[PDB]
């Protein structure tokens, strides 16, 4: 799945179909992406057997479930409220979860794709999400260091800041996982906004 934003109003979408074949759909509207485009890094669209629909596929990932698809179950995949009819550009499941993500971003002081924005405000949003990532990387090691409070902290502390951050992240709680999932989807949103506002 590759969405190319051609200008503020127009995109094309290239998706796998079957065998070695991909299909490119032109005249893809940028206006409504929130209603169709999955923000989750654990999913992407493929072209449906008959070419009318874009259908979700779960990638191999430890990220949380979204859109009511835990893994690839064609009851849900083929179902109308879980896919996007091409040219209609509406996927209720995707829209529903996207909207939670949007509200979260609004709560963090980030600009959102459903309200007005321009290049400057998106750029400021990337500034702010970078700040969130950094603070987060501080908290992750803080929490790991408590756990895991053994006097062998000296061993951990024999590493560089990066190796420490890496080991803490590797070993972290599911809660932390949820924070990074959320932030990844918000990042995807801000990027769609950046591209539309170029």
């Amino acid at each position: 799945m590759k969405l190319k934003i051609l200008d503020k109003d127009n995109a094309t979408l290239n998706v796998f179909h079957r065998n070695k074949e991909h299909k490119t759909i032109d005249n893809v509207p940028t206006a409504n992406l929130v209603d169709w485009y999955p923000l989750s890094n654990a999913y992407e669209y493929k072209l449906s057997r008959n070419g009318e629909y874009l259908e979700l596929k779960r990638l191999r990932s430890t990220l949380p479930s979204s859109y009511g698809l835990d893994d690839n179950n064609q009851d849900i995949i083929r179902d109308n409220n879980h896919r996007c009819k091409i040219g209609y550009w509406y996927n209720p499941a995707v829209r529903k979860d996207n909207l939670k993500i949007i509200e979260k971003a609004k709560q963090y002081g980030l600009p959102i794709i459903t309200e007005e924005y321009d290049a400057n405000t998106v750029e400021q949003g990337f500034r702010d999400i970078g700040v969130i990532f950094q603070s987060l990387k501080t908290i992750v090691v803080t929490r790991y260091l408590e756990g895991k409070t053994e006097e062998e902290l000296r061993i951990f502390n024999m590493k560089s800041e990066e190796s420490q951050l890496n080991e803490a992240l590797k070993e972290s709680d599911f809660s932390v996982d949820l924070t990074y999932s959320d932030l990844g989807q918000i990042y995807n949103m801000l990027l769609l906004m950046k591209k539309i506002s170029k």
Binding site: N41, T62, F133, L165, L169, S172, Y180, Y187, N188, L191
Partner: protein, 62 residues
Amino acid sequence: MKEQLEDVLDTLTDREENVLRLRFGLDDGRTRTLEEVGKVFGVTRERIRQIEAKALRKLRHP
């Protein structure tokens, strides 16, 4: 290699391109560890590394 990296990203899927944007700090300015990136994608450090390698190989040829 801002333009060349961009031409490469154009040949990747949304997911792979965003792995690399995160990694190289193309949007927020901050480069990220393979572990931060892997956490954002729910994949291992190694898978992120393979994506990065794929991109470097594409970056070399045309």
